[PDB]
Amino acid sequence: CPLMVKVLDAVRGSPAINVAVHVFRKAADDTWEPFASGKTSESGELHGLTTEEEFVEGIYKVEIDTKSYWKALGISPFHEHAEVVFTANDSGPRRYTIAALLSPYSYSTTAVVTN
Amino acid sequence: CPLMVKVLDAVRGSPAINVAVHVFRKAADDTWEPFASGKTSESGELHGLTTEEEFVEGIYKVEIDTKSYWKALGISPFHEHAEVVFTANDSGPRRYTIAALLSPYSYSTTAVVTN
Amino acid sequence: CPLMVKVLDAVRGSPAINVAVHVFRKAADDTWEPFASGKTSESGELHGLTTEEEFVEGIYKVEIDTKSYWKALGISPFHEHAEVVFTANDSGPRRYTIAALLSPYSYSTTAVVTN
Amino acid sequence: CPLMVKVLDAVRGSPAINVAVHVFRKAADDTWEPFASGKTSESGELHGLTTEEEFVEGIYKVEIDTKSYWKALGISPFHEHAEVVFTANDSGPRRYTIAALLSPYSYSTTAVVTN
Ligand SMILES: O=Cc1ccc(Oc2ccccc2)c(O)c1
Ligand SMILES: O=Cc1ccc(Oc2ccccc2)c(O)c1
Hints:
Four copies of one chain form a homotetramer.
Chain A: E1 3-9, E2 14-15, E3 20-26, E4 32-39, E5 45-46, E6 58-64, H1 66-72, E7 79-88, E8 95-103, E9 106-114
Parallel strand pairs in A: 1-8
Antiparallel strand pairs in A: 1-2, 1-5, 3-4, 3-6, 6-7, 8-9
The structure holds 3-hydroxy-4-phenoxybenzaldehyde (2 copies).
One 3-hydroxy-4-phenoxybenzaldehyde sits between chains D (6, 8, 99-101, 108-110) and A (8, 99, 101, 108, 110).
């Protein structure tokens, strides 16, 4: 599990459950191609998106559908989604955790990169 | 100024100066078209991006070139850029201020919508 | 104004208005003594807290009454208040801006030190 | 383990290791009395501070010594420490995770509260 996504809700102080997540990888032709997708679990975590074999050097985009999330809680949020864009696996393979903390008009994202 | 961008640097505790900012508007074929751009001023702000006449309802993307900012300071950054995607919507006469606070492996962004 | 405070609301995407702010200076017996206070303005800002003559080097604490702010909006908050503790130090002629971005279970704060 | 503390470094994108943490509990006489203390582990987490028997209703202060942390990395940071102040265990016992994300001039803190 070289790529993991974790989402917290800053209004409720709890994991953000059932948040859709789509990952894309920048193609040879500069296009965003579909790489992996998942929903967060009761702990707000999404494991198993990829494998170290699949997850090669590349520019990746992790899209967290925060608008759907807030709307289901009756909140009409500012952002369409949270987008995280980064180069992965230059120094060789690493483990990436992409965290986001969500509020209706604000979010933050941090990466924790290992080995 | 219906739309303003403000960037701060969390490592140095200062406005983030000379950061390039590109704004796009989503067009009918779901493609991003270039709408407005500039670089932040000594105060970390970018004013004069658009006019009320131009700024119509629609989905906009604001892209903050964080990677180049960190590179020109010698600091190894994680993200390619910071992205903010939102729907501008009447109701109204709102000023949108898109603010962002930058660290090498983390950013936050918030929208302040007034008047 | 050598010291300014600025608060934003991440749930509503607006300045945080009428938030009480207390500033203290640490005295010789390691006790906090009341230095300056006020409430944020319609723009979420609090100016005029001190003067350059008064603001000498020392350890200061800035306490933002977040709990009362959330309660007057009906939202159940986690923190009693947000606290910022720092050493003011010459080098210099700096303006200190203490900014804070508020959610019910989360806050961030940043210092912007200029001139 | 009803109280856990987790600290991330936003400059390095890694857990913040060996960060001292002190917890206080507000006494009957309005004084902050010493409750528990610990250092974060290689994962940036601090477990075992207290027990559900010990950890009664109260107002608590979690002090994270961020200045020592940054100074050991050669950074002279803005803040003396991060202070998190909250009422614990009104609805009966809960599980509290206090997270902080650190930068030299900025930090954020979020609580995740369970059961
Ligand atoms: O403290 C956390 C934090 C505080 C404020 C921020 O944005 C602004 C900074 C200064 C003025 C207005 C907004 C922000 O992005 C993060
Ligand atoms: O303090 C602000 C803050 C703290 C933690 C965060 O991510 C995590 C939350 C809990 C555990 C681990 C990481 C975060 O995104 C913001």
